[PDB]
């Protein structure tokens, strides 16, 4: 069964790196796109960026300048890198994967979440 | 690509067919999901693709619309349904959340 | 309608008088008494009314909401929530996994995939309870009563005028073994096939008590694995396969006023009635002669027998001698009972099972009698 | 008991004199004559007597004597005893083997499992050949005598005191299709199913001939495997799932005395009587008038139908004129043959088929007769 | 043959006269009249027409043209031609493959085996139509008619010298229910099983409407993969198995003359005469008493019968006290209607059904009557 | 599914070598017995020989002196080498597989075949 | 060893029981198959061990013979029959063809 | 189908060492405790001992002190020590099994044994 | 621990209901079990864990006892049951034998 698990420092302090890892549980990660996201308490989600297995990320227009995400095949775990942060990213922060069937045109997804990690 | 959804507060009763609107920024065709998040946990998806369900929603759910605008719907209101609700766009790219939908009791 | 013999009814010294006879449905049999008017008895309906649901099965089916879930060799099995809701067809295999596709070493993964099972076109089957077969029989003077029978219920009596109070005692025979057959419904369409026949279709079925799909198989593809994913196809239809085979079964028509009863066209009820102590009149009828024509040749039943139309022109009220013979003596069986004309230039119905093989049917004595040539495999 | 009319017998001019009577089971009819005592005829009981096994249907089962084998990867398959003897469930398929596991390379390893099947608790399921179908008659003076019949022998013969020899033959009407139906056993309980309900229970089933129980994977789960290791589980009972389905279906009360003996509720007989030749006397009944009510309100019966009870105050001996209806005429079917009441303040059974849906029951004529609500689905 | 007692016919004041008189094979009921020969009737034969095919079942199989193709590690799945054509059984596994086998790795490799499907012999089931039951029934005088009965066509009416035109309404006694029992046909021999002993066979069977046979794997062995290779066997003949569970279940003799036909050994017909208006006579027949002895002893009929024959010295035409009891009253049933013997020294069968357990049966009246000790289970 | 095809240079220079290499592709080259055969344009077939896996060989007596045909099991390709060659050689070249059962009697074949190659 | 065919032209029409005769230099038991090669093509097998049949080939076709000589059939003659027919030895070492009856139409 | 079998030098000379080794075919000898027995000819049985994969043996408490029993679970045989031999331990010597299923709990026995093998 | 069984020898005929006993030297509970060894073959498992039979033994054999006693029992003996039997102790770790009470005919 497929769970997703986010880990690391949960207290970070600014202009500095972060380093977020989101572990795969009960499932293979060469598919699908795997993303993340943020909540800033008293506000709603903001949809931060994906990468593939191969290695073709996307990310939010807003961010990307700040923003590595890392994809490790081998100890399943895509990681997430966001530099220069402020108060601003102060927030809750999901890893949750996105969908591809690909051999069937059922694609539409953002299905299993984490509990996401509070990061200061 | 940006989502606006209206009402963003709403007060209804245990029973009534309740109507959230979700606007895009431009026509998106038929890509747009639909969350259920209550305070705590996180974001669980509902709707996929315009209108079809996931297993694991009650059939009182129900999302509608093409191109431009896209509507949520609960035929009879329930307990568990009193949470927060957003909307998603997919760019063939890069994606966007909406405002959400504070759903609360009246 | 056709009056009575002598033989057919009989009066007693004391007590009533019976009649016995044997109607047929479309005919009517009429009996007389003097310083009466006359009684006319027919069988209007045989019907059956909505016989128990059975077994439902699917010739069309449709998929949706697909999900497919992945383990590198060594993880373990591949595990989907929808393996155990039973909306949905699932499949476990094993994968060729390795470098290409971002696992951990080289060997079989296992893969799940599942996908939910919707029906969009269904057959019904219904079994017929054959102590609930309705029959319905009118009585009319020449003051109308109307006679609702049940398989069970054979024995009715109705009040009168002069005739008094009569008490029928009717049984029910039925043209096809109801225990050997199911009604199937398609659409709007329905007919009876043979029990095994249904048993034996290769398309998933679910009982009359609700229940899964079984066997969804029958029209769901599963291609074989790759990397990580299957193509999952629902099969064409299969319309066209079971209409196919639905032609070698007659159609049952439905009802026109009640349309929810099942209307039987062949079989008869032989009855007895029971009649307070009156003397009635036997007409005698005799066997006709001259000229006799096919109205309707002979022509097949669909279930061994076969029904042909004849015309008389000069024959007055006269019995119809129908035989079937391979000069020689028949070896056939008459099916219509009473094959008799009331009026001249009126076309009557002649039922018959031939014997196997070639064969010559005669209708009539003489000259004007007919003859045709029949053959059945 | 109750008379016959007039035209329930006939005598004639030479020979003897017939009664035609359809009796009911809890009802009795009587036959007088002048210068004679009264024959009292009853049916007494409708049975079948030990009835074909056909399959048994373990609903709860047990697992005994466990037995595991093992074998590493390209050390060929799994091979257990077990795997040949019929008691025990087998399943075979292969784990994931290494270093942790004491094999010689990593790979999937064959293991085979077996454990003994004990059926703890099952459902028996019974045939019932209709030609074996046994009805007794009791016909007495006012001198008893017993009359066993079968449904195949229906011509049965009795010696008299003034009535002389007699001759019955006799035909026996089932109140349910034993062509669609099955006899169920669980323990002390007994009831009349569907063929096809039982033939598609998901359960274990072992053939009347005997045999092993077949599908044992209804019942048994083996669960995936680990290293060298499988937990294998005896689902729980199920017994109160097939007494929840067997809820919708009528319950068969077993035998007092031969406690071997099935005895069916419903059903009728139909009887002719040869008699010698002498005059019977007809009691002509009247339609009943007056004061009726209900005894025990209309009520369900479990097999498409509905039972009532009635009492008459003023109405002598009178018939009862029972119609169902939507002023109208009746559309229903009067079950009951000669609904007629014997003494006052004695109560009487009606049963009825009525239409579908919403009707009216009608019992009696006039002012004080009866009216009762009925929906049917 | 045997005459008719006076109350087996009724003669009218007025309309005709009436007989009743259950017909069993291999004996006849004579009917007398004065100034008139006497009227000879009897059932000659019940028989079944060509009762459609509904599954045959392969007890001896052959397999023919055996291809096997092989995948080493990684290159996919192994497919053959042969999985798609209907004709060969086809099995999938996978092998131990390595260095002594010519691959690139180690690991298990697909290998798929077929074979051509042949059945040597096969054992097929028929249905039978009970509408269709036919039964023939001559009548002659002391100018023969032979009556072509159907179990639909019960009402055939004849002419006559003298006795003029009769009119026959017959219906038929089955003595085994049709509904839960197959005709099974076996090379030169068949007969009458259980429907659900054949449908819980495991042998493969193929539909009546054809197609190809199913579940081939249960005279199918498809050994363990080895390098590259599968020894398929083809399973020994179940032709003994069949047979000897074939005992415990009558034979169905074939015909002599059609040879297309089925005939009954048992079942009965009843029939109800109607006749002119004519005087008939009554030979009133005395019970017997003296001198009887067994010609053949009491024997099992396979059906839950027994037959005996017994012979008479001084009894003149006499009627035959057959009863068996636990001095007390019988429990049993008498299935041989009028047992009557016309001329003293003759052989005369006697049918009956037996409580179950140990019960005496008891074959006339004082000194002379006859007993026999029986068990039944 | 099964099939077998030819390849190499379709022109060689006389009294030279020859180089043909049937590939056999979705089937294992472990069993049966490999064989070539020619056929020269206007006249008909000529066994040339065969060649188990473990590599027992044989040839035409009538060419063994200038054929030699290898087995590769691991690229699954057995090939034609045919020395001293001259235009009588200059024919089609099919490759095309024998059969063996083994633990079934069911032996005699020539299977699958490939399409040839013209050689000059 | 050395195989001989007889006729090696044959003029046929569609319907023609035609036959193929074909001799072995010695006795062969029951070891020996046919060929049908339409020009382009390569040879196609038909028969399989003297009268046995393959998957594939029409039931018109018909192989006898054991020991010394061997014949093809066509029960009814067919338009893609019209092709080149070969025969084949197996000497349980070292294979052999035959010169190959050519089937022509009439 | 699962057997043991025990081998060695079925003679001895006195106060030296022992080496007896019971092949076990058939099986994985991953599971259950691998035992010994002894028999000496005109007496009964007596229990030596066993030992589990992982490698936790367990002896008689009249024997240990001259008993070694080793697991090999490459060649899947254990194998028997006994040093400081007399003529008692002349005797017959069976390698069988005991058992475990562990995940289920039915367990006692001593199931397979060997045809044993006669020392001196 | 230590076990003994009574008797050790026995004179029985074909038929005869035989019972042997086996006390421990202490409480073990239902953890025993009984060997058949005709001379010449290795030990035969019968019974495990004081009444269960194995798979391969007839029904005539059964066993019963828990905590310090233990019976074996023949219904009818029979040929191949004359052999010597004996009991297993299980300690939760050293296991100990019986010595043996041997079967003969009378």
């Known amino acids: 069964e497929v769970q997703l698990v986010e880990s690391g420092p949960r207290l970070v302090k600014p202009s500095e790196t972060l380093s977020l890892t989101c572990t795969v549980s009960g499932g293979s990660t060469y598919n699908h796109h795997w993303s993340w996201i943020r909540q800033p308490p008293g506000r709603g989600l903001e949809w931060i960026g994906y990468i593939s297995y191969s290695g073709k990320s996307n990310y939010n227009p807003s961010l990307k300048s700040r923003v590595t995400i890392s994809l490790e095949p081998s100890t399943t775990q895509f990681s997430l890198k966001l530099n220069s942060l402020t108060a601003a990213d102060t927030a809750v922060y999901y890893c949750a994967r996105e969908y591809r069937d690909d051999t069937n045109y059922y694609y539409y997804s953002l299905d299993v979440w984490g509990p996401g990690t509070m990061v200061t | ?106 | 309608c056709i009056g009575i013999t002598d033989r057919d009814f009989i009066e007693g010294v004391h007590g009533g008088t019976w009649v016995s006879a044997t109607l047929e449905q479309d005919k009517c049999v009429t009996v007389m008494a003097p310083d009466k008017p006359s009684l006319d008895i027919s069988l209007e309906t045989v019907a059956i009314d909505r016989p128990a649901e059975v077994r439902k099965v699917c010739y069309n089916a449709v998929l949706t909401h697909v999900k497919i879930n992945d383990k590198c060799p060594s993880t373990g099995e591949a595990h989907l929530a929808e393996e155990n809701e039973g909306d949905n067809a699932c499949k476990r295999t094993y994968s060729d996994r390795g470098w290409g596709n971002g696992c951990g070493l080289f060997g079989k993964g296992s893969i799940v995939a599942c996908a939910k099972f919707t029906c969009a076109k269904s057959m019904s089957l219904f079994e017929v309870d054959q102590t609930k077969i309705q029959y319905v029989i009118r009585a009319q003077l020449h003051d109308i009563k109307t006679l609702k029978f049940d398989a069970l219920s054979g024995s009715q009596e109705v009040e009168f005028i002069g005739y008094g109070k009569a008490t029928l005692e009717c049984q029910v025979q039925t043209a096809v073994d109801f225990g050997n057959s199911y009604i199937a419904e398609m659409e709007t369409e329905s007919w009876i096939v043979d029990r095994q026949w249904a048993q034996d279709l290769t398309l998933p079925w679910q009982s009359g008590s609700g229940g899964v799909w079984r066997e969804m198989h029958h029209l769901v593809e599963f291609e074989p694995p790759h990397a990580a994913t299957i193509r999952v196809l629902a099969l064409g239809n299969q319309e066209g396969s079971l209409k196919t085979a639905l032609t070698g079964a007659m159609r049952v028509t439905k009802d026109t006023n009640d349309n929810n009863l099942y209307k039987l066209h062949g079989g008869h009820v032989s009855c007895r009635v029971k009649l307070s102590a009156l003397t009635l009149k036997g007409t005698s009828y005799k066997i006709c002669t001259d000229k006799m024509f096919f109205v309707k040749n002979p022509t097949d039943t669909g279930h061994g027998t076969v029904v042909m139309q004849v015309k008389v022109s000069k024959g007055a009220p006269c019995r119809i001698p129908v035989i079937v013979a391979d000069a020689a003596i028949n070896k056939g069986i008459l099916v219509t009972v009473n094959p008799i004309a009331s009026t001249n230039d009126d076309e009557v119905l002649i039922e018959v099972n031939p014997p196997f093989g070639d064969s010559y049917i005669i209708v009539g004595r003489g000259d004007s009698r007919l003859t045709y040539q029949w053959h059945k495999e």
């Open chain 2, 1 to 106: 690509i940006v989502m606006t959804q209206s009402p963003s507060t709403l007060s209804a009763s245990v029973g009534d067919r309740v109507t959230i609107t979700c606007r895009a920024s431009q026509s998106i065709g038929s890509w747009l999901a639909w969350y259920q998040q209550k305070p705590g946990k996180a974001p669980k998806l509902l709707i996929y693709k315009a209108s079809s369900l996931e297993s694991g929603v009650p059939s009182r759910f129900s999302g509608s619309g093409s191109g431009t605008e896209f509507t949520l719907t609960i035929s009879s209101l329930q307990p568990e349904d009193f949470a927060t609700y957003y909307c998603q766009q997919y760019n063939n790219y890069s994606y966007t959340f909406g405002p959400g939908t504070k759903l609360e009791i009246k």
